[PDB]
Design a protein around this nucleic acid. Structure first.
Lengths: 64, 38
RNA sequence: AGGGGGGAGUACGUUCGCAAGAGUGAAACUUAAAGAAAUUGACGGAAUGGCACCACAAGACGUGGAGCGUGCGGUUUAAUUUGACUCAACACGGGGAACUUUACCAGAUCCGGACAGGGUGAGGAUUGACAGAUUGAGUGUUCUUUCUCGAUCCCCUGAAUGGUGGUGCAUGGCCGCUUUUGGUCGGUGGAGUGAUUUGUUUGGUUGAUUCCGUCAACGGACGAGAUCCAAGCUGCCCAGUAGGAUUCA
RNA sequence: UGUCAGUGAGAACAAGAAAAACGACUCUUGUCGGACCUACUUGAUCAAAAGAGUGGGAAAACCCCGGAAUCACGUAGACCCACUUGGGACCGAGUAUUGCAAUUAUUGGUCGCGCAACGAGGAAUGUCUCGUAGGCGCAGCUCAUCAAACUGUGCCGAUUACGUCC
């Protein structure tokens, strides 16, 4: 009774990436780590995996 | 090769003088102006 | 003398006969036809008249047993996909196929399952995704990570479409062959109860139901012939990519 | 094998038919050349296979639009009645070419093996009477690439019969 590959994933976000930078006294800063030089603006953020970071959409090599 | 008036690619493709009419046989599919008299 | 066909001229009895046999003569059981005549087809080691180097004569060239290519059969194998088998199978399926083509085999994938009518919008079963893993496939299918998200993709039914799957004995179209010969059919009239026949017939001629003649047939329609395509000779057209003639050189 | 006859050379001489165009670049007020062939020259101060540049064509233009096989040849060529110097099929090594991918795919190539078969081949059986049979070559076809196949054109070109129905 094995279907092998393909299943439901249920993943990605919840209410996470809720808003931009919170404000109304001073700006406090994002959940994650920055993306230098995206082409879709800085609303994209980079992975934490193996001390490397990677942009899942603009596909850059940048590390921490 | 491959054919453009079928997608079969088998039952033989004519590419002589830049035409295909042998994946739909020309006896059935005439009015190309050809005739037999001899 | 006979009362469907077999059983049977058998059985039993009885009379005749030297014997072989003769006369008389059932039943049990079984079967749905047996039989008569004529007609139209097919076949004949039947007859007659004709026609074909797919028939033969005379005789030129091969195949048939070698070494090769190709197809088929057999066996084999994971699969050795399959149609076709005297001729109208077998260098055939315009089929000289290696991955593609591909039926078939070894594995993975897609939605094409569209169509939401019964459900999940945001954050979904999702679209796209580096690394890690998955696995032949760092492939992003998948699973983890994290990112990119239209809400179409996704959930359940019904519905669906796609197919080189079978059936050519469901079928259309097309092709092969019967048949490369001269054959085919109706109206009106004649004959027969009818099925049928005459027309389409003795003779000669021709590849020819091609002709002339004749006749219970008369007048017709197709195939044949002819019209077409190509070749050989030629007129007219006729010249700058067609090619020669004379002189100058 | 002696009626191309087997290895060498030179001469004269053939006909249909195939081909081209990518939304790919560049070009403008609405757009041109590259996937076809063949020519010519380097490819020999040193092979073949094979590299590249220039040049023309949509074909009666493509260089003479058309050529080398059958054939001719005594140039006083070589072989010479042998399974060979007649034939190839197996087999190993090398290299270049084609392609999305080659696993002899490549194959027009080198050079081994040939002294591996086979000597016109039992019975049986095929099809043609004239420019035909037979012999020979070329192109088209299929298409990453290969034709002992198929289709078409041309060349050399007879013997017998022109009767019968067995």
């Amino acid at each position: 009774p094995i279907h092998r590959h393909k299943l439901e994933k249920m993943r990605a976000l919840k209410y996470f990436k809720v808003t931009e930078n919170d404000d109304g006294s001073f700006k406090v800063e994002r959940t994650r780590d920055e993306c230098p030089n995206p082409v879709c603006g800085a609303g994209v953020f980079m992975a934490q995996h193996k001390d490397r970071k990677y942009c899942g959409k603009c596909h850059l090599t940048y590390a921490a | 090769r491959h054919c453009v008036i079928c997608s079969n690619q088998k039952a033989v493709i004519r590419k002589y003088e830049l035409n295909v009419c042998r994946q739909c046989f020309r006896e059935n599919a005439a009015n190309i102006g050809f005739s037999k008299l001899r």
